[PDB]
Structure formats: C-alpha cells, structure tokens
Amino acid sequence: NNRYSFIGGRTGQWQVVKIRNVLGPGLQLVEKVNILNGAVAEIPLDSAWRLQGFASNIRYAIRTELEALQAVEPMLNRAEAILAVLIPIKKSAQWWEMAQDERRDIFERESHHTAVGLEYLPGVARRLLHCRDLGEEFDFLTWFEFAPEHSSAFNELLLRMRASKEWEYVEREVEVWLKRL
Amino acid sequence: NNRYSFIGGRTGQWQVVKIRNVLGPGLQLVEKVNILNGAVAEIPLDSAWRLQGFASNIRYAIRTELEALQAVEPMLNRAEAILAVLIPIKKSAQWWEMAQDERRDIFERESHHTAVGLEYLPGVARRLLHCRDLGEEFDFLTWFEFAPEHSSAFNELLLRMRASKEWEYVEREVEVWLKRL
Ligand code: HEM
Ligand code: HEM
Ligand SMILES: O=N[O-]
Ligand SMILES: O=N[O-]
C-alpha cells in the first residue's frame, strides 16, 4: 500500500519533541504520533488530528538528479536515526495553476531544491508523500529522519529552503519534531 | 470535490453503446454508466464494476501548450456532444520508474501527444482523471465527448495515439462508448 497515516495523540511509535507552527494554522500539541500504513477511516479516540498521504511517481527530478540521489540517499529506519521531523506543507493556488515547466523552473532552476538537499545527504533520510489530491488541508507530508549529530545541519537546511523562491508559494507549514521510541 | 466515480450497471445518465476490450482484461458489459462526483465505497446492488479517479494538476503540459489548448478546447456538456468515450488506461511499471525528463520526452517529443490531440479540437471535449495513486487497477480514466459527426475523427485519433511510442508502455486499455440519455 502507498497510503500512510499520521495520528497525533497519546499513542504511537514516535514521541513528540515539539511542534513549531511555522506558517498558518498549526497542529495541536500531542504526546505521540502513530504512523500506520494505509488509510484510517476511524480516527482513534483520544487523538487530536490525522494526516494522511500517499507515495507517488517522480514529478520534477530528472534522470541525472535521480542517479545522484540514489547514489547517496540513506535507507529509512537506521539504528542511529532516532530523531525525525514531519513537515506538512501547503502551496498556494497560484502554484498549482502554473504549467509544468514554470513549476520546474522555480523548483530547481531558481530554488535548486535538489542540489541544496543533496548537500545534507547521507546524513538525513527522507520520504515524500502527496495528499492534495486526497482533499487534505495540506498538499504534502515530508518526513526526515537523522541522528542527533545532524540536528544542527537539518536546521541549517530548513533555513536555506525557507529563503528560496519555491517557498514564496508555501501557504501553510508545521514542524513536528519526533523521537524514536 | 475532485473525485469522480463511474458505476457500470443498470442505471445512470449514459447508455453503453459498446465496450471494446482493446488490451488486457476487459470491463463487463452493462446497460448504463452512472457518473457521480465523489467517492463511492458502497457499489450499488445492481452494478457490475466501479471506476474512480481524481482531477489533478498538470504533469507534462508546458505553458505555451496550455495556452494553445485553452484557446480552442471546448467545454463539457455541450448540447450537441451526445457521444462519449471512457477509456481507462494502465501504464507499465517501466513507465512509472522513469524520471520526469524521460517521461516528458516520450509523451511529447516522440509521441507529440498534445500536438496530435490539438488537431481534433474543438470537436472533442476531454477530461483527464488520475487513479494509480488511489490503488486502482487502472492508472487513468480518460473521458471524451463529441457530436456524432466527429465519431470518425475520434477513431482516427485512437489509431494515431496507439501507434505512438507512448502506447508501447500501455498494458491495459478498454473503450466504453456511451450515448447521453
Ligand atoms: C534533505 C534533503 C532533501 C532532498 C535530497 C530533497 C529532494 C527532493 C526532490 C528530488 C524532490 C522532487 C520529487 C519529485 O520529483 O517528485 C523534492 C520534493 C519536495 N521536497 Fe524535498 N528535498 C530535501 C529536503 C526537503 C525539505 C527540508 C523540505 C521541507 C522543509 C522539502 C520539501 C519538499 C516538497 C514540499 C516537495 C514537493 C515539491 C512539489 O511537488 O511541489 N524537501 N525534494
Ligand atoms: C483528443 C484530444 C487530446 C488532447 C488535446 C490531449 C491532451 C493531453 C494533455 C495536454 C495531456 C497532459 C496532461 C498533463 O500535463 O497532466 C494529456 C494526458 C493524457 N492523455 Fe491526452 N489528449 C487527447 C486525447 C487523448 C486520447 C484519445 C487518449 C487515450 C486514448 C489520451 C490519453 C491520455 C493519458 C493516459 C494521459 C496521461 C498520461 C500521463 O500522465 O502519463 N489522450 N492529454
Ligand atoms: O523531499 N522532501 O521530503
Ligand atoms: O487526454 N485525457 O482526457
């Protein structure tokens, strides 16, 4: 199954370290986050929110970039990757109205998204889920996990991405920092 | 709502004229197709199958191409457009593993999908729905409607599309011809 759900509440495999309401309406603070593979129609009792997304095909990356990423990208669930960050993101309607070449030019030519992110591998593992087409309040659920030694590097990366032209189209953003239980 | 459901059965707004099983497993013959805006977890009692897809953002079309289509494409629900064709399509795993630049090269550079399709406007209205990310047996639900006087032109377009490099990656196709009731 390509669907994944993220349940904010009192149970889960991940302990919430903090929630930073970066931009727009935030997410209610909770004790844990439970990650399930599949959809969850029955939102658990004693649970504050539910985020769901699906893995999908590549949308912007080209062959040379995929080869670069595939050459260094770390696997998920490394023994040492005990910190994780779940960053739901929403982009503006103006972004989704643009043609494919316009969005690619902003994504890479202007923001150099992949080139910048490649500088922080193999320290950080990542997973990208889509959820706009599901009608969710967010468009993407991004997931990053890494060892504590790279926490400062991840914060650096966040600052660099948040100054890019691409992020001028971001309308809602939240950071949920997690600790592997 | 961006989700659309197509129920094959004994009720609906469209009458099935014929079902041609072009490639792979087919669709059971039914009297009518019922189109519903929204998801449908409960397939009606007197129905054979259920297809669902969602409208999504542009994945390949360039700005200049979108401008060319927007200048000639007709709207849906024209009084004259009493014929419709619903063509579910599945593409091979080899297609989905390719990078964005590779898939775009096959779609337009080699197959000229959009240049070829533009030659049959404004006769043919169209709607593209995505369903692979929903876990459906098909990847796309394509919809076309037109006046009977264009039926020969549409068939010609089918033969042209099926001879393209893009269609070498198609591994399941069905044509459901419909008449507005
Ligand atoms: C850490 C290293 C990173 C790498 C290697 C990386 C790489 C990529 C690549 C190659 C894509 C394109 C996927 C596709 O073609 O479909 C992508 C998409 C995306 N990334 Fe990252 N990225 C990184 C960090 C981040 C961070 C820190 C964030 C958010 C804070 C982020 C948010 C996104 C979003 C929202 C998308 C979807 C873009 C869209 O479809 O509009 N990425 N990333
Ligand atoms: C009749 C005139 C047609 C026009 C103007 C046209 C135009 C287009 C355009 C511009 C796209 C790109 C959508 C995007 O960028 O997201 C597209 C996608 C697609 N079209 Fe057509 N098309 C036509 C006919 C057809 C026919 C007859 C079929 C099937 C028999 C078809 C099947 C598809 C499929 C499966 C896709 C999605 C491909 C993918 O995303 O991998 N089209 N069409
Ligand atoms: O690729 N950003 O999760
Ligand atoms: O061109 N898909 O309706």
d(CA B28, CA B50): 11
List C-alpha distances in Å: B124 to B62, B83, B149.
21, 10, 11
Ligand 2 atom closest to residue B140's alpha carbon, by position in its atom list? 35
Amino acid identity at A24: G
Q: What share of chain A is helix, strand, coil (3-state, %, to 5)?
A: 30, 35, 35
Candidates B60, B96, B101; nearest CB to A63? B101
Selected for mutation to probe chain A from B2, B56, B57 (highest A CB count within 10 Å) is: B57
Distances (CA, A) of A72 to A26, A61, A181, B10, B109: 33, 15, 26, 55, 31
**Tokens representing B122?**
């404004």
| Amino acid in the structure at residue A85 | V
Among the bound ligands, the one closest to the CA of A88 = 1
Which residues of chain B make contact with A130, given a CB cutoff of 8 A?
Answer: 133
The letter for the amino acid at A96 is: W
Q: Alpha helix locations (H) across chain B? A: 63-70, 93-97, 100-104, 113-118, 151-162
Q: How far is the CA of B175 from the centre of ligand 1 (A)?
A: 38
- Could you say which DSSP state residue A108 is in? I
Classify each residue of B40-55 as buried b or exposed e, where b means 16 or more C-beta atoms within 10 Å of its C-beta. Answer: beeeeeebeebbbbbe
Whether the CA torsion A118, A124, A129, A131 is positive or negative: it is negative
Cβ contacts of B66 within 8 Å, gap of 6 or more: A99, B58
- Within 8 A by CB and 6+ apart from B125, the residues are B73, B74, B75, B76, B78, B81, B144, B145, B146
